Amino acid sequence: HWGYGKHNGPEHWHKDFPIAKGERQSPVDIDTHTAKYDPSLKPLSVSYDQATSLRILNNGCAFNVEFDDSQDKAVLKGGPLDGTYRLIQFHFHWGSLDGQGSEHTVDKKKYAAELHLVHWNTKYGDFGKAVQQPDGLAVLGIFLKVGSAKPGLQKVVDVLDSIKTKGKSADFTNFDPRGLLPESLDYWTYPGSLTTPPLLECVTWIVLKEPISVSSEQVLKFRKLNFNGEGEPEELMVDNWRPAQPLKNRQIKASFK
Ligand SMILES: NS(=O)(=O)c1ccc(C(=O)N[C@@H](c2ccccc2)c2cnnn2CC(=O)NCCCS)cc1
Numbered sequence: 009h010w011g012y013g014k015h016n017g018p019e020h021w022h023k024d025f026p027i028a029k030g031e032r033q034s035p036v037d038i039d040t041h042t043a044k045y046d047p048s049l050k051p052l053s054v055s056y057d058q059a060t061s062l063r064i065l066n067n068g069c070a071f072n073v074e075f076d077d078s079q080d081k082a083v084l085k086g087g088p089l090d091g092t093y094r095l096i097q098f099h100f101h102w103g104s105l106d107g108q109g110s111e112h113t114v115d116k117k118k119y120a121a122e123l124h125l126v127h128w129n130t131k132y133g134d135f136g137k138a139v140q141q142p143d144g145l146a147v148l149g150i151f152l153k154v155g156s157a158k159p160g161l162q163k164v165v166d167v168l169d170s171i172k173t174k175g176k177s178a179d180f181t182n183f184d185p186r187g188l189l190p191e192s193l194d195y196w197t198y199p200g201s202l203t204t205p206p207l208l209e210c211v212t213w214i215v216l217k218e219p220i221s222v223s224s225e226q227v228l229k230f231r232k233l234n235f236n237g238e239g240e241p242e243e244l245m246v247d248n249w250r251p252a253q254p255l256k257n258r259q260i261k262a263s264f265k
Pocket residue numbers: 067069070072099100124126136139147201202203204205206208248
């Protein structure tokens with residue numbers, strides 16, 4: 009029932025998921041002047057060289073590229089994290105217009121889109137158990153701006169034709185998520201939540217400072233997707249972002265001086 013319309017969008021979610029008004033909700037606005045460098049942060053390790061992608065799925069919210077997480081293959085370690093976090097999927101949030109689409113904002117600036125690489129803490133054995141823990145997940149967030157094309161994104165753009173409507177999937181093997189990273193791994197980190205229902209407060213957020221650039225044509229292909237299922241009235245999959253939530257008693261830490 010929840011979605012991103014006037015009748016079922018983020019302002020309505022709290023009626024089915026009261027944690028929507030919780031103490032560690034995401035996303036947030038990152039006030040870069042209030043964020044503090046934290047010398048206790050260890051180097052961030054993004055280790056994706058043995059990633060094994062499997063499939064791409066339109067789940068009615070976004071599209072997810074899913075990975076084989078049955079072994080340590082593609083993992084996130086270091087930074088604010090304790091232990092090893094395994095990549096399970098990535099997806100994006102985007103706008104109807106280039107001036108909006110990201111979930112996190114930076115000094116109130118909205119980006120055209122935001123990539124979420126989702127990882128779970130291997131100490132909990134599987135994703136389902138990890139989402140019952142306050143340090144169960146780590147999401148690596150990457151902003152997208154419109155400018156030059158991102159070559160590493162093109163294979164995603166070109167399969168979207170095949171998963172236009174909710175519940176469609178396609179084989180998506182041998183995709184290398186390293187092609188979606190910016191040059192610098194400088195980040196902000198804070199404790200938060202899933203940004204969609206069930207909005208569970210399990211996430212260590214790691215949001216990169218440097219955006220990647222994608223072309224107008226690339227983001228336009230995202231906006232041709234549908235929220236609805238085949239045969240249903242066409243609802244373009246656009247503006248699938250939750251706005252910034254109250255920071256409450258949290259501190260955002262920076263990895264850079
Ligand atoms: N935006 S985010 O990175 O913060 C984020 C990351 C992961 C999930 C997620 O795994 N949600 C699934 C889940 C299954 C079991 C327990 C809890 C959560 C779920 C539940 N119903 N559908 N899904 C799939 C889901 O919503 N896919 C993520 C695409 C966001 S537009 C949601 C948001």
